[PDB]
């Protein structure tokens, strides 16, 4: 029941996203047209204004004398599908016999793919990502030796009970997904869906997850997105007793059906911690290498 003119003539409730742009097919590189000399006034395609924040709309047809070039170079290798569907190391778990880390035949590894710099920097180019994945578990001895041993790879989502030992009752995998493998067999390989409560993962969360006063005590919460905590990956030696082969499981993740939003500046400083864009402020390095003089190369 709308009667006044201040609500009939309104734009409130306009859910349609008005865009200035339009994605057009670019299967090949842009071709070049033939260009001649211009000796005129008024039109100046070389003078720009970067103050507008836009980029140069210039060409080489407008700036030099060019020939017709038919470009048959494909733009198919710069897709996200090709750039990210390359299995990289995201984790590495050791099941030693003795020591300090995991001397009791089991190990839990909380999923963060931000422990090795090669795959981190490649995903931290973007702010939001939505992808399926394919994990692959390459288990072996420190020496690389392959051994006849049976393992159990359990996925423990959030809320589910983490196993406290090797003979714990969570390994029964009644509703949790698990995988059994021999190491004499090939590496395991499972495909995974997009499992977050949000429409995408996000490697940078500018804010705090919990309400309340924010003191120096619980300051470690800054940047923690629980929409990214997909849980825990556990691994044991299937048995009632101690094994005799030390083991190392390496995890290799490959994305599929990738979508990404909001590119960022790529990191030029060295990572130091996980899920934390900290740096060494004493040893700041330039993102390039130096000269001695600007006139001499």
């Amino acid at each position: 029941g709308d009667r006044v003119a201040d609500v009939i003539e309104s734009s409130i409730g306009d859910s349609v996203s008005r865009a200035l742009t339009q994605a057009l097919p670019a299967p090949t590189g842009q071709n070049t047209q033939v260009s001649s000399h211009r000796l005129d006034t008024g039109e100046v395609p070389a003078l720009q204004a970067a103050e507008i924040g836009a980029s140069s709309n210039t060409s080489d047809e407008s700036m030099i004398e060019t020939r017709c070039v038919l470009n048959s170079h494909s733009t198919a290798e710069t897709t996200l599908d090709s750039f990210f569907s390359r299995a990289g190391l995201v984790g590495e778990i050791d099941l030693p016999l003795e020591g300090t880390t995991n001397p009791n035949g089991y190990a839990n590894w909380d999923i963060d793919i931000t422990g090795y710099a090669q795959m981190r920097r490649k995903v931290e180019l973007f702010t939001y990502m939505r992808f399926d994945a394919e994990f692959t578990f390459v288990a072996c001895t420190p020496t690389g030796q392959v051994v006849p041993q049976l393992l159990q790879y359990m996925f423990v989502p959030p809320g589910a009970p983490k196993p406290e030992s090797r003979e714990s009752l969570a390994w029964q995998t009644a509703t949790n997904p698990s995988v059994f493998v021999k190491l004499t067999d090939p590496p395991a390989q499972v495909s995974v869906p997009f499992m977050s409560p949000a429409s995408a993962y996000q490697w940078f969360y500018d804010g705090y997850p919990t309400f309340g006063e924010h003191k120096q005590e619980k300051d470690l919460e800054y940047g923690a997105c629980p929409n990214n905590m997909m849980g825990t990956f556990s691994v044991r030696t299937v048995g009632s007793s101690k094994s005799k082969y030390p083991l190392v499981v390496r995890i290799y993740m490959r994305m599929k059906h990738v979508r990404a939003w909001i590119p960022r500046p790529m990191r030029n400083q060295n990572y130091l911690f996980k899920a934390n864009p900290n740096y060494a402020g004493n040893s700041i390095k330039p993102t390039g290498t130096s000269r001695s003089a600007i006139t001499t190369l």
Binding site: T78, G88, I262, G288
Partner: protein, 242 residues
């Protein structure tokens, strides 16, 4: 008992195989996707954006890392002096490492196409001058004078209302694609040099400052393409993360 024979390539894990793997979760339907703005569909959207090409890569200490994004323009004796010079090779270690083009091209091995370099004058409105920005194709040594550099490609840029000129470094290569230059045999893939010379002078009235700065902004064009994805080399990492 369908008879088969297993061929070489069995029980190998190739990291770049586009195959079917087994799901862990049946009948899982993921969270639906909303309209988030800024969907990147191709990385050649990000190679056309102009980012800062830091020519003045002279300083090394901490405080003067902001000096490295703008190179100065003072008043000279009018003899057509040299202001600055830099190579036109994006994947090579130099000014272009500070650019997105120079960081995505590290993830690829071969590139082809034209480049843009945009220079913006960051001086007073009463300041005026003219500069010659030359592109010297390969073979060309470092020019010792301005008359040797005009023989290449060049633009003459008069400061004014529009504070920005663009030099298009055009695609001039024997090869269709071009790999990453470096010292030695891979100098076969050099793109050339870019040099900037005082055409007239930097003229300034009383009161206005006798020195300014120019900010370079490098990009690529609609004909640019990259190929043969690799792993980047001009960034390394000290081990033991956390």
């Amino acid at each position: 008992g369908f008879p088969t024979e297993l061929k070489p390539g069995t029980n190998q894990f190739l990291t770049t195989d586009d195959g079917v793997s087994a799901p862990i979760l049946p009948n899982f339907h993921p969270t639906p996707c909303i309209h988030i703005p800024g969907e990147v569909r191709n990385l050649l959207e990000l190679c056309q954006v102009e980012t800062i090409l830091e020519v003045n890569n002279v300083p090394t200490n901490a405080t003067s890392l902001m000096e490295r994004l703008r190179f100065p323009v003072s008043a000279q004796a009018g003899k057509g002096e040299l202001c600055a010079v830099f190579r036109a090779d994006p994947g090579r270690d130099g000014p272009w490492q500070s650019t997105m083009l120079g960081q995505l091209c590290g993830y690829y091995t071969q590139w082809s196409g034209s480049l843009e370099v945009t220079f913006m004058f960051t001086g007073s409105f009463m300041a005026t001058g003219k500069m010659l920005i030359a592109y010297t194709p390969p073979g060309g040594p470092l020019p010792k004078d301005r008359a040797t550099a005009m023989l290449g490609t060049h633009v003459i840029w008069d400061f004014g209302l529009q504070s920005s000129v663009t030099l298009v470094i055009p695609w001039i290569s024997n090869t269709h694609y071009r790999a990453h230059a470096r010292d030695g045999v891979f100098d076969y893939y050099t793109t050339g040099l870019v040099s900037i010379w005082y055409q007239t002078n930097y003229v300034v009235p009383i009161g206005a400052p006798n020195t300014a700065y120019i900010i370079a902004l490098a990009a690529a064009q609609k004909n640019f393409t990259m190929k043969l994805c690799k792993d980047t080399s001009h960034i390394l990492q000290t081990a033991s993360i956390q």
